[PDB]
A paper describes a structure:
In fungi, plants, protozoans, and some metazoans, sRNA production often depends on template-dependent RNA synthesis catalyzed by cell-encoded RNA-dependent RNA polymerases (RdRPs). In the filamentous fungus Neurospora crassa, silencing, or “quelling,” of transgenic arrays relies on [name]-1, PIWI/PAZ protein [name]-2, DNA helicase [name]-3, and several other components, including the ssDNA-binding protein RPA. Interestingly, [name]-1 may trigger quelling by producing long aberrant ssRNA copies (aRNAs) of ssDNA intermediates that frequently arise in tandem-duplicated genomic sequences. [name]-1 can subsequently use its aRNA product as a template to produce dsRNA intermediates.
The five domains formed an extensive groove, probably accommodating the template and the nascent RNA product, with the catalytic site located at the bottom. Superposition of 922 Cα atoms between the two monomers (dimer A/B) using the SSM server returned a root mean square deviation of 2.15 Å. The homodimer interface is stabilized by a total of 119 and 115 residues of monomer A and B, respectively. However, it showed a striking bias toward generating short RNA products rather than full-length copies.
Numbering used by the authors: 22 to 212, 226 to 249, 263 to 565, 568 to 676, 678 to 812, 817 to 868, 876 to 894, 907 to 922, ...
Amino acid sequence: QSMEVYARLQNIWPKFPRWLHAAPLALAWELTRICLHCKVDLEDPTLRYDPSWATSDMAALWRSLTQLDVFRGKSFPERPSAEAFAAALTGNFESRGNTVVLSASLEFNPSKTGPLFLLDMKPLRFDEGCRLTRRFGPDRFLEVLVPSPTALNAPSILKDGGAAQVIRWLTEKPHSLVGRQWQAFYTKDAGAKATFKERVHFFAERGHDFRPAPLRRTEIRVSEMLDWLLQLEQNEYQPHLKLFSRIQLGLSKTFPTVTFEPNQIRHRTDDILSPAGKIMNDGIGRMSRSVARKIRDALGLSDIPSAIQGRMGSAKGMWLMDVADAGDDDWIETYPSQRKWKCDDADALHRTLEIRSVSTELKPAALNLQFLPVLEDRAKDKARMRRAIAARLMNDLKKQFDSQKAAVERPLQFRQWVNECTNSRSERVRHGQVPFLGGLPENKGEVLSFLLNSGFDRRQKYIQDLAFDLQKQRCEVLRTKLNIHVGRSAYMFMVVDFWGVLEENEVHVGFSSKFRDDDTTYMLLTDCDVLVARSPAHFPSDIQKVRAVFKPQLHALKDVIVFPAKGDIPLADKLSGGDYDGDMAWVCWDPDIVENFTNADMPKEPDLSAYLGKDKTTFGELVRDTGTGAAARHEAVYDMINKSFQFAMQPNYLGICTNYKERVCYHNNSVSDGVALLLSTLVGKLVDQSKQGILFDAASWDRLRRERLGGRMSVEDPAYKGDVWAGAGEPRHIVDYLKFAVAKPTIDRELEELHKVMQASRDDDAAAHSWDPDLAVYFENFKALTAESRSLRAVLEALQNALGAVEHEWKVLMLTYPEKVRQLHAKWCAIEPAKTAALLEQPFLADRGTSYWALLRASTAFKAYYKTNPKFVWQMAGAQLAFIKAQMSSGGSDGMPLLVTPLMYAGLAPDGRFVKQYLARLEC
């Protein structure tokens, strides 16, 4: 509708040749991927169809195929998972709760009658299912990441002609792909530098397989889908954009838990009201004890959660355990603030609890920098608070280094430390073992435990090396983000108190178990003040002090925080406009912080009405534009999609006014002047921009700053937006101080104290050397063999020349990193040898990686490139040096060699109880 665009927007999506029409979608999609990966044109027939395809494992279909030689080629692409692809033909797209996705990804192109957008079809991926995909079949949905067409900028034709035919292209008709008609329904914010994207959800309305009609695969429009989900005749009263936003409830990624009976769902008509006006339980309502037992059962938690975040048809938010239920019937209640459209809750998938997230066990959280200036403002003593905060930074940091340098002195304990600092557990479960990247584990802290399990020390330069990398990389996190750890703080779910036990400024926090703070332990909080705060805190009052009081009534509500239902304003609200619908709280009970805090009073949101303008046009006025009947209802849906998209794709000002605030407050060295309450208010209203259909745009933004602020022009980036310190004097600003003056120096200092220390080795005995005589014991033995040789001799010499060329390969390969590491591993694993040439290789062993040659390969590798390329041999052979180092450091009769298989090994962990008691005996 320009036209520039058209013709552009061609041919963005590839077509569908008659040889692929046979079905199914699975191979059709993955074959489309192969063809454009291999840059083969799909409009070359001379091709056919194979029934074996309907059965196999892509590599099977991918080895067809290829043959053909022009499919040689190449190989790849990334390829879908084992459980996924088989389900993509014969498992109907689903494993228990995890659906199979179709996901494409769009980035810009330049010219024309050229595309404009470049497709990237990711392979079939398992994700969790939502309600629509569960209802209509996961095969009928597509999600693409699309660049926003109002993100300036881009290549020039983009927005040279600002407009927006782009959006009209996405919404108006379908998009023909792999035989199907995909029609857009929802558009959301994305869940040197590249550009920002919009996630767009298409629903396949028809295609090559399809058949009518009300009252597989049937024909079925986006208009009927939403009519199912939303139930449209009973919801005309809604503003269409607000009804559009509600789509997000049917798309939310959730685990299905229980379907209730209509009686067992207790739809409350009123919210609990202020003693009085203000709802005191926004989004939160009780579930039964049994549903909570059930939710554990269903998902498999190691314990019943006291609270849950789900979805329940039209309902959304938090359910907590009713403590006053003792009994054995399942029930759940719902409240108005929960229920987001009028749902009759008829069919089963509107009656079923879909679980988003559970109450799980707290971890120490610390203090994000966003809260820093707020705290400084509400500090009693600002200097002492500065000194309070910085001190805690350096001590946790001292604490984690001294703990780690002491551990390193003793294998058992150095192993024990690594295990207490990360987790490959959820990765191990995944791949059935310790996933391995060439010759060594993927995760570094897994790499250490294996090389220590195999009997290595701080005699080995590589082991020293990795110990340093681990802690350094966790330092990096801290020097950028200022995630300043606070031993006495957690992130908790807010819950409200339905039983009237806590008073206006009283909260209840109990743990599900022993909370560790370094010195001391906790299992609840009583008779002590606590700071509560929802991220982000923008007002001085968005951080609130309250008294942590325990009530044994609520003993059973664990790992959450209970706010009162009493007084005028619910606490959740006081914390940056919160409510209880998933929102979590920064709960700090550190005395040194809390007691220097003094409460501020809730501001009044200033009159910003001339800039904030809700488009309240309803879904019923949109139908009335079509004249009556179901038809007028059918097109209204497409009116609304089309119009909601033009809104959805406007620039997210939320993030731009928040940036401006972070700059205007930093310069103005205030969070508590008048221009800060004006922005704080504004960024408040804009978090709801989506679901309120608010009109706030380039015009209003300029208009505002003209009339009420500075200061249109680029306000400066703050100093802490760099690495090293910019200006004149040791820093004044709290955040600059904390970054440049404290964190940087504290870290660099302690990084060095154990790079001192490496590095001291020379031959004092002590210290670290890549060289280890044990690790070349296969090499030397075979080198005098081979003296004395004949053609053995031929064996060794070509191995050594081979290895050379492989390390040469590493040199370049200095284009994805593990890929490179693998590419050149297989070239490493390719080095292959009357008489012992029958033995060493041992091809009754299925895979070259548990043979004796492999040792010799690696022990020889080591001597030649330990100089030199220590790394190169560890990333290829590391597990083969492990055999060696395990065999040789063993004497025999003082322990034999116990070989644990990958699964059994990934099933074992270091035994803290044993390490504590076994040192207790070594230090007699």
